[PDB]
């Protein structure tokens, strides 16, 4: 009998900060130091590809565009990948298909027994250094990733709602990105879409036709595309500007009892 609410979010400047650090967006807004701003951006993107790359397949996944990981999952045998090796696989359109479907099935599995032990994937130097950056960033950005988070976790530890993500950003290194910023945890990952290639009205459509009408939709973000395909299909839209409407949000989620 329950109302059941679903959170589409978006990723950049919304729950974490990342590209504003590279257009001193942010640290002219708020009255930061641009050159650390930068160099801070600069070392979380060579962390987020390095990761795509060496854990991800990036540099093989990065050209199929693809929205869901699961979306070749009909290639694939659900055989053991533990012991399979990717490298020396010759990586067509139905051979292919599965191992295709293979990589992403892997990145599914890393994402999953990593989610909250990053550390232990990108192993040792890098933890420490992925540590400190991301104490400098929580510094430099007024702990906007823990404002974020407050919300994301009352959304997953609350019943009645689910947390989705919707962005832009291509697939792969958008699973990275959501790792590197600790996000793992709360986000299952067959609720991460890439809009890169549909756009993300479309995302937005197929999220709707996979949780129903009786469900109700609240798009979360910082930009127009997001907005503008809030109104195309009459979801409510939650603008993030702030720091403060992050509060604002957490707060009304702390309200209601579904
Ligand atoms: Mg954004």
Redesign the pocket.
């Known amino acids: 009998s329950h109302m059941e609410r679903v959170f589409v979010w ?5 729950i974490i900060i990342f590209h504003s650090l590279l257009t001193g967006t942010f640290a002219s807004r708020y009255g930061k130091d641009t050159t650390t701003s930068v160099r801070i951006g600069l070392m979380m993107e060579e962390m987020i590809f390095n990761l795509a790359d060496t854990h991800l397949f990036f540099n093989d996944l990065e050209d199929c565009d693809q929205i869901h990981v699961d979306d070749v999952s009909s290639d694939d045998n659900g055989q053991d990948l533990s012991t399979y090796n990717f490298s020396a696989d010759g990586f067509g359109g139905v051979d292919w298909m599965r191992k295709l479907a293979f990589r992403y099935r892997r990145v599914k599995e890393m994402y999953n027994t990593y989610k909250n032990n990053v550390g232990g994937l990108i192993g040792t130097p890098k933890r420490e250094t992925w540590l400190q950056l991301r104490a400098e960033l929580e510094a430099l950005t007024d702990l906007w990733l823990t404002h974020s988070l407050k919300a994301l976790n009352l959304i997953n530890s609350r019943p009645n709602c689910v947390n989705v993500l919707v962005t832009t950003t291509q697939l792969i290194p958008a699973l990275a990105k959501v790792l590197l910023y600790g996000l793992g945890s709360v986000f299952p990952i067959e609720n991460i879409y890439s809009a890169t290639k549909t756009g993300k009205e479309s995302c937005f459509e197929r999220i709707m036709q996979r949780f129903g009408r009786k469900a109700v939709y609240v798009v979360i ?3 127009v595309e997001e907005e503008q395909g809030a109104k195309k299909h009459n979801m409510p839209f939650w603008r993030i500007s702030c720091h403060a409407d992050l509060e604002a949000l957490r707060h009304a989620l702390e309200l209601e009892y579904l």
């Open positions: 978006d990723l950049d400047e919304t973000g910082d930009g």
